[PDB]
Design a protein around this ligand. Structure first.
Ligand SMILES: COc1ccc([C@@H]2CC(=O)c3c(O)cc(O)cc3O2)cc1O
Ligand SMILES: COc1ccc([C@@H]2CC(=O)c3c(O)cc(O)cc3O2)cc1O
Ligand code: PRO
Ligand code: PRO
Ligand code: PRO
Ligand code: PRO
Ligand code: PRO
Ligand code: PRO
Ligand code: PRO
Ligand SMILES: [Zn+2]
Ligand SMILES: [Zn+2]
Lengths: 346, 346
C-alpha cells in the first residue's frame, strides 16, 4: 500500500499494456510482471534515444533496468513485452484490433499444428481474457519454439560485402515489393539493433537512431543475397524519394530469408558520421520473430564490426540469438565510426 | 535548407514527417504562406500526455512569440496559429476517406450560406500537383463564426457551487453515449485546457496533465446542463471502471451544447491535490472547433477560478475565444489548489 502496478501474463491484452506503458513518466514506473510461478518487479522507463515510425505510425520503446532484462514496444495498433527468463527470450504480443489479433494468433499458431508437440504451451500460447473467446495476446518463447519446430538452420556465413547533442541518424527501412511484414516483428528488430549500439561505449551521447519504414518498388531479382543487396543499393541511388538522404542508413526488409538460409547482408564498414555518402551504409534483413537480432548484426557490420570468435557475441559468424557486442575490437570500431574517442570514456 | 511546411499544400504526411523529426533540442520549421514565411522553433510538449481511445496524441509548441501549437496523432495532425488575434487551424487526416469526411463535415455549414469571405474562413487544401481530393482544411474559426452567424453560446451560470517531480493528474474524458466527436477537436480542447494551467505560476513544476478518452454509457437525461452534470457525477460514483480514480478530474464530452446555448458546466473549486475525492472534480464540455477553450474554461472553474471582469480573460462570463487566465486572484486560487505557494515564485 500504495499498490504497485502489475501485468497479469495469464490475461495480458493490448489495453493492459497500453494503459500501463502510457502511465510511464520521465522518472520511470515500477511494474510487476506476474504469471503462475513467476514474478518480476521491473523499473520501466521511456526510451528517449530511439524514434520509430512504421508507415508514419509512431512506435515508442520502453526499457527496464539492466538487471530487469525487460523491454517493451508500444504503437497504436500493437504492444510487445519481451523479457529473458532462465536464458530464454519470451514475447507477449498483443494487437489492439480483434481481426488483427486473430490473424496474428493464427499466423504464430500455424507452424505448431503439424508438429503438435506435447510441451507446445511453453513455446507458444494463445492468451485469453480472465472473464466464443478470442485471444487478447500470444506468448512466444522463441528458444523453446526453435526446439519444437524443424526450422532449417539459417546463418550469417558470408553475410557482408567488403567495399552536447547526439547526432540523429535515420535508419530507413524499406518493405521489399511483394513482401508482408508485421509491426511487432519489425519494431523488435529495430529495438534490438538500436540497443546493441547504445550498450557500446555510452554511444547514446553520440547518436540517436530514428527508424522509419516505407514500401519500396524494389524487389530482389533472385533469391541471392549478394545480387539482392547490389540491386537494393543501386535502387536507392535511382530513387527520387531517397534524394538528399545518401548519408543515412538503409535496410531492405522482408519476412523471409535469402538463398543458403542467409538471414541478412550488408556493406561492411560503410557508415561513418563524417564520411557517410552514396547510400553505402545499406543492407538487407529478415524481420521474422524467430531470428531476433539479425538487423542488429547487419547494423554491426555497417558500423565496421567483423565476425567475432565468442559464440555468445551478436557478431558470431553463426546465428545464436545473442543481442550484444562482446568484442572490444568491434566495440571500438563501431564507436569510433560514430564519433567516439578513447579519451571520452564511457 | 531549413525545414518548411507549405500552407498551400500541407498534408498529414508533411506535418508528421516534420513533427516526428523534432528532437529534445527543438527544431526550426518555416511556415510558408503566399510568399510570406514564419520561422517557428518547435519543441515537443513533455508536460501533457493524451490518449484518445488508447491512441497516443503528441503536442508540440512554438516559442511564446511564435503563437503556434501542433497536435500529432497517427490519424491526424493539427497546426494552429494566430493572425490578427484570429485562430487559424490546418487540420490534416492521414486516411483519404477520413480526410474527405472531415473536409465535407467542415464545408457543409458554408454551403447553405455562400459567403463572399468564404476562403479566408474555410478552405480545402489540395496537393501542389497542377479529380483531386483535399490533403487538409484551413479554418479561421473567428471568420467562420461571423459568416455562419451561429447562435451565441455562452458561460452564464456554467458552474455549480459545493516538488522535484510534478504530480500526474489524469483528466478522464468520457464521450457521452450516442455522441460523436472528432480527434482533432477533442485534442485541441485538451491542449488549450492544459496550456491555460501551465501558463499560470510555472504550474508545470506541480502538475503534468494526462488526458484520456473513453466512451461512457451515461447520457444526459435532458437538455439541462445542471441536471446533466448531477447525473454525470452520480454515474461516475456507480461506474466500476472509475473505481479507484475518484481523486482525478472528469469531463463528459460531446460535440454539441446544452439548453440556453450552454457550452459546458463544472463543479466550482472541486479539485485540490491534497483533498481530491468522490469524483467531485467533474464537469461537461463541448468539443466543437468553433468554440476553442471551453474545456480550459471549465477546468478553470474546477481548479477554483471564478468569472473574471476582463473581457479578454479565459474566465470572462461570456464566451470570447481567449485562452488564458488574466485574473491574478484566479491564478492564485488555481495554483494554490495544485500545491503552489507564493514563496515558491513562478
Ligand atoms: C526525414 O524524413 C524522411 C525519412 C525517410 C524518407 C524515405 C526516403 C526513402 O528512401 C523512401 C523510399 O525509398 C521509398 C518510399 O516509399 C518512401 C521513402 O521515404 C522520407 C522522409 O521525408
Ligand atoms: C490509464 O488508466 C486509466 C485511466 C482511465 C480509465 C477510465 C476510467 C473510467 O472512468 C472509465 C469509464 O468511466 C468508462 C470507460 O469505458 C472506461 C474508463 O476507463 C481507466 C484506466 O485504466
Ligand atoms: O484492445 C484489446 O485489448 C482487445 C483484445 C483484442 C481485441 N480487443
Ligand atoms: O511460462 C512462460 O511461458 C513464461 C515464463 C515467464 C512468464 N511466462
Ligand atoms: O571473441 C573475440 O573476438 C575476442 C577475441 C579474444 C577473446 N574474445
Ligand atoms: O575481454 C574479453 O574477453 C571481451 C570478449 C571478447 C573481446 N573482449
Ligand atoms: O499523404 C497525406 O497525408 C494525405 C492523406 C490523404 C491524401 N494525402
Ligand atoms: O508561399 C510559399 O512559399 C509556397 C510556394 C507555393 C505556394 N506556397
Ligand atoms: O479576433 C478576435 O477578436 C478573437 C478574440 C480572441 C480570439 N479571437
Ligand atoms: Zn555477419
Ligand atoms: Zn464559467
Amino acid at each position: 500500500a500504495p499498490v504497485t502496478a502489475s501485468i497479469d501474463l495469464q490475461s495480458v491484452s493490448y489495453t493492459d499494456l497500453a494503459t500501463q506503458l502510457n502511465d510511464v513518466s520521465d522518472f520511470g514506473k515500477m511494474i510487476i510482471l506476474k504469471d503462475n510461478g513467476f514474478n518480476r518487479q521491473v523499473h520501466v522507463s521511456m526510451d528517449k534515444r530511439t524514434k520509430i515510425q512504421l508507415d508514419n505510425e509512431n512506435v515508442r520503446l520502453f526499457n527496464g533496468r539492466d538487471k530487469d532484462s525487460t523491454n517493451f514496444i508500444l504503437g497504436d495498433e500493437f504492444a510487445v513485452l519481451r523479457f529473458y527468463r532462465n536464458g530464454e527470450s519470451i514475447s507477449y504480443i498483443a494487437y489492439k484490433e480483434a481481426q488483427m489479433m486473430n490473424e496474428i494468433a493464427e499466423f504464430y499458431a500455424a507452424p505448431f499444428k503439424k508438429t503438435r508437440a506435447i510441451n507446445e504451451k511453453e513455446a507458444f500460447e494463445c492468451i485469453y481474457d480472465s472473464r466464443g473467446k478470442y485471444p487478447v495476446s500470444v506468448k512466444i518463447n522463441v528458444d523453446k519454439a526453435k526446439k519444437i519446430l524443424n526450422l532449417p538452420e539459417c546463418d550469417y556465413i558470408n553475410d557482408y560485402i567488403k567495399t552536447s547533442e547526439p547526432k540523429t541518424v535515420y535508419v530507413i527501412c524499406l518493405r521489399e515489393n511483394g513482401s508482408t511484414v508485421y509491426p511487432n516483428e519489425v519494431s523488435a528488430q529495430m529495438q534490438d539493433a538500436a540497443n546493441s549500439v547504445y550498450a557500446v561505449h555510452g554511444l547514446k551521447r553520440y547518436v540517436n537512431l530514428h527508424f522509419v519504414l516505407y514500401t519500396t518498388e524494389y524487389a530482389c531479382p533472385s533469391g541471392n543475397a549478394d545480387e539482392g543487396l547490389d540491386g537494393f543499393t543501386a535502387s536507392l541511388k535511382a530513387n527520387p524519394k531517397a534524394e538528399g538522404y545518401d548519408d543515412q542508413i538503409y535496410f531492405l526488409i522482408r519476412w523471409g530469408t535469402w538463398d543458403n538460409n542467409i538471414l541478412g547482408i550488408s556493406w561492411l564498414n560503410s557508415y561513418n558520421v563524417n564520411t557517410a555518402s552514396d547510400f553505402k551504409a545499406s543492407g538487407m534483413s529478415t524481420t521474422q520473430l524467430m531470428y531476433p537480432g539479425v538487423m542488429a548484426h547487419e547494423l554491426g557490420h555497417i558500423l565496421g564490426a567483423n565476425h567475432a570468435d565468442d559464440p555468445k557475441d551478436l557478431m558470431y559468424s553463426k546465428y545464436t540469438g545473442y543481442l550484444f557486442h562482446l568484442s572490444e575490437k568491434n566495440m571500438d570500431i563501431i564507436a569510433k565510426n560514430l564519433g567516439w574517442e578513447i579519451a571520452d570514456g564511457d
